[PDB]
Design a protein around this nucleic acid. Structure first.
Lengths: 136, 130
RNA sequence: AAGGAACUCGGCAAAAUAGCCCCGUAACUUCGGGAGAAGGGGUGCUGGUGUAAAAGCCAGCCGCAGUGAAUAGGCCCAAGCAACUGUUUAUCAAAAACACAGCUCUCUGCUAAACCGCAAGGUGAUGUAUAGGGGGUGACGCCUGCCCGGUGCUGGAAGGU
RNA sequence: GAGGGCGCUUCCUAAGGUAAGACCGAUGACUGGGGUGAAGUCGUAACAAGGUAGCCGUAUCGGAAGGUGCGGCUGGAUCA
RNA sequence: GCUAAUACCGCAUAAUAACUUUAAACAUAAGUUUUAAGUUUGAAAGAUGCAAUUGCAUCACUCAAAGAUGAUCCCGCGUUGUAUUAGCUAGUUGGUGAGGUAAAGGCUCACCAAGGCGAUGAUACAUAGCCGACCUGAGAGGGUGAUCGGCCACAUUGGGACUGAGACACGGCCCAAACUCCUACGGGAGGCAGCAGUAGGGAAUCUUCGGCAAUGGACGAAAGUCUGACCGAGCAACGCCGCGUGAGUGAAGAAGGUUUUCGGAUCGUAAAACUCUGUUGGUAGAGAAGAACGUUGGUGAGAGUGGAAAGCUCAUCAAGUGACGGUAACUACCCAGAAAGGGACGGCUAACUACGUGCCAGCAGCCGCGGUAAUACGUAGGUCCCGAGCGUUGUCCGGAUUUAUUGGGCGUAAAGCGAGCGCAGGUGGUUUAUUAAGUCUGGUGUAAAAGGCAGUGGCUCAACCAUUGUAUGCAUUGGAAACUGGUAGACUUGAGUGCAGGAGAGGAGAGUGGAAUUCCAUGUGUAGCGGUGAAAUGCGUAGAUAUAUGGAGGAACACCGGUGGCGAAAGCGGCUCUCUGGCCUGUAACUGACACUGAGGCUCGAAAGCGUGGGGAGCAAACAGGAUUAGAUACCCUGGUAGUCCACGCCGUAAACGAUGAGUGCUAGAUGUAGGGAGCUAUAAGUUCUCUGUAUCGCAGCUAACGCAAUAAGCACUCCGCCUGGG
């Protein structure tokens, strides 16, 4: 730690990774490597809910949507809740979410969205997964 | 090496008191005479003496103990390293140990004490606390 | 004309470029080269001024055209073969053929071996194993694996012949 | 007559072409590695002196764990 | 063709403007500065008027006389990352001249000179409007540049240039291009990054509303005029505040829900009732918010303007100062009646039982869960925190000391280069004096502001706005010699050099000797030897090994040999020479700090292998044969190639080790051994101190522990280096 060493030395850092590689969504002019002004969503599209094998020993079967990504990334993100109504050529919102039990993911999907119905009076918030406060 | 007889000397005082022994050593300067002078005046050693003809004259110094050779000096250090001549202001020269510590600063007048360094608006190099 | 290789097995022939100066010049490279790479510009005359040792200047005059004609490279990309220069069937064939340095092995201690001649004589060479003769392969870079059964060679001698 | 627009060439000159790059992205038959998942199959290694302790750098032979050898160190033993 | 000019223009009259002069106080490489002779040229002879000592006001050139404003360029300062961003630069850099400019200025251009930059980051590439400020962090700071203010830049794109005092100019021009429109195809025209607003695209609409009174500017004598600036209204829970939807009495578990071991329990002060009340809104609405200053006329004062006129200065009154407008506020206050929901409960942090489940579907930031009664989930009740907002992710700050200046570590957990030099660069034994450079004090600059620490008023009081101070390297200038730096000066007391000692496997060459292995013959004799757990391997009857000798050759040199020494290590051991460093002991003889380092660059350097040429005993990669077992490409054996050795060049990587950088200082001891210095023990013996060495235990200190500890893993400082969770 000499005179020149402690002047050469900055307060540098190297671990810098926000969890959302994001072209959200967006301003489609001509080239669309416009980056980064990230959403908590995507006003984009995906195609098909597939079924994901969970980890050991998690005997389950979970629903990932085949996520369209124009930026050469995962055709997957997790659909929460029981069931889904969407299909191919449907605009799909993009939760920034991670599950260790769900392999190969980076993102989740906002269920409880404009394209989502459900059954209310849920013991967590009554209104996610496509629900409201019950109008009776 | 020879390039810091100040913290070499104070470190040697920590050898003398932490090893709980009588006499420490220092070649002949004027600054170290002010070290044992000011701090003897503040009651930490018990001798001011050096080898009578040498420019490297051994300032051999009996210490001022507690009650069983007990320490008085604990956090002895040089503040301004030889790689950094510490140049502080004069107006807000800070307290040491909330007042429980020494301070010695080569101001424009001389090398004066803590509050004499504070409120006389004299400032210089910070040297040593306890 | 206009069009270009659509002709053909095949841009075969012709075409066209090239001089001098001055810019500039990729690739790999065994670091020399490539390479004149390519591509570019100029180029006549008049007076000056600087050209005589000496281009460039200035202006003008002109021009279809300014090495006014002659004479004088088509280039590029890539692969295979061969390194290359040399040599090659004159009365067909110039090449990948030969050769070549290189590399490899083997043979020869001297009146060499080997060779030519019946011999004599002589070469080998007034040479002495870094030399001479034969065989392979043909720079440089990497590498040359296995098998002695058989053949040949070498060496050994027990016995058979 | 001066001067004047036009009369009148040149200079710089915006754009377009040229050539020979370099940079950077996209893109790509086939193909090298790596990671993931099966729970196929090959194997005895590495772990106890883990079954030849190893562990290095290096050369070299294996389908592969790996071996042989050059030298060095315990992050090695019964205790030498 | 002609007017008009509040256009133009020649042309005397204007000369301190510029220069032409003659002297110089001054003047600094340039130089700046007063007067000492000669030059250019003016108007809206206008304007409304007034009136008059017939002359007085608003202005353009007369153009200065300055201030003032707003600009100009140059310099100091800080203002991103990539050296896998090395050599870069041609008007480049100087000199002279000229053009320009408001100006020195390759500012340009001509000519003549060749420099210069740069490895202590120049160019090239990515990226960026910047700053005040602002969110977070206690601060250090991190982070942002939104909105506000300043500067800069831009105007579909690119480039010119006139004008204009000022532009290369959102709403100038010209050119090009790209769109678009019209074209009868012969031509013309334009750019919402202005406010709106439209279509794009998303998380991202403010409305295709009024007027300029409340300013702001522009002209206009004034009046007036325009201004999508501004003011306001309307959109957005998009943020901040503030109130509230009931309050008070009255609670029994009360009807009521749910659990339920059949009890108990919700409603917690509307509660089931009762008494009232008007937050916000009901309606009637009284009022309806001052949003407001004179420019327009009068009066009077001043310049009193030769002149009172008239007008101008600015001291009065009259005079409209509207858009939110019956605007907030206020009365009559209506009925508790119109006006609270969202998240969360496995923990992780507070809030668990009915509860289909049955690793099922699903939940989740981490630990996770769910496979029979899951406070995880779906599920009801109870609860836990909040509110017109709740929660969710998207970003950032903190925690994170998780680059540790503040505020790291490096023995093993990530790490000390593989070791030496001696380049910069860094650091400095003591002391005399100067210096004040840095260092401390005083004056000077400081954000227009806005913003904090306070205060004031207020949309009430709220929140926040308006105000008022305070608080600041923004700077330049006097002092201080106490430190450092510098400047001169001194001494050795560190280093080294002297004179004496020794010592060693220190290196490099030049040679020599013996043992031993294998082989050439060789005595003379018979199957032997090999190896293991054994043999096949094999060789050998061609009769040998083994034994008798001599020769040949390479290799290496047992006790010597050791926690021994030397060498930075790598490493170094038959013997003898050659020239060869490096220490230590003493010593001041002497220099007088010559010191320590050490990026860069340089050198050396294991082990193999690679080049050429030799030497070729024994050993042994490669491979073969024989066991081995399922198998053996391995361990064993038989062999046996490369290779091991010699000169001669290279790799630059080793557990490099002690996974412990270099320098020097400090200090409990028990302890090894060297070789000196000194004593020492004397009629020969044998002890004590001192130095570098290298152990072992262990004081202190010490770490996660293990351990280190005089040749510190203890306490310091200077040179370097590494290190950031794993693959």
């Amino acid at each position: 730690p000499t005179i020149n060493q402690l002047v050469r030395k900055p307060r540098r850092a190297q671990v810098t990774k926000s969890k959302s590689p994001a072209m959200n969504v967006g301003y489609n002019s001509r080239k669309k490597v416009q980056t980064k002004l990230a959403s908590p969503q995507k006003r984009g599209v995906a195609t098909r809910v597939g079924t994901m094998t969970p980890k050991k020993p998690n005997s389950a079967l979970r629903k990932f949507a085949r996520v369209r990504l124009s930026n050469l990334m995962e055709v997957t993100a997790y659909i929460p809740g029981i069931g889904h109504n969407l299909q191919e050529h449907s605009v799909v919102l993009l939760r920034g979410g991670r599950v260790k039990d769900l392999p190969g993911v980076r993102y989740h999907i906002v269920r409880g969205a404009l394209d989502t119905a459900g059954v209310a009076d849920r013991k967590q918030s009554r209104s996610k997964y496509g629900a409201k406060k019950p109008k009776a | 090496v020879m390039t810091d007889p100040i913290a070499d000397f104070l470190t040697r005082i920590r050898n003398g008191n932490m090893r709980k022994f009588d006499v420490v050593e220092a070649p002949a300067s004027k600054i170290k005479r002010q070290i044992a002078e000011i701090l003897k005046a503040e009651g930490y050693v018990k001798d001011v003496e050096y080898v009578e003809d040498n420019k490297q004259g051994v300032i051999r110094v009996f210490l001022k103990y507690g009650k069983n050779g007990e320490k008085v000096i604990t956090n002895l250090k040089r503040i301004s390293k030889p790689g950094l001549r510490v140049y502080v202001k004069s107006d807000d020269v800070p307290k040491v140990l909330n007042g429980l510590g020494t301070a010695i600063i080569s101001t424009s007048t001389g090398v004066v004490t803590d509050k004499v360094a504070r409120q006389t608006n004299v400032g210089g190099e910070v040297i040593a606390y306890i």
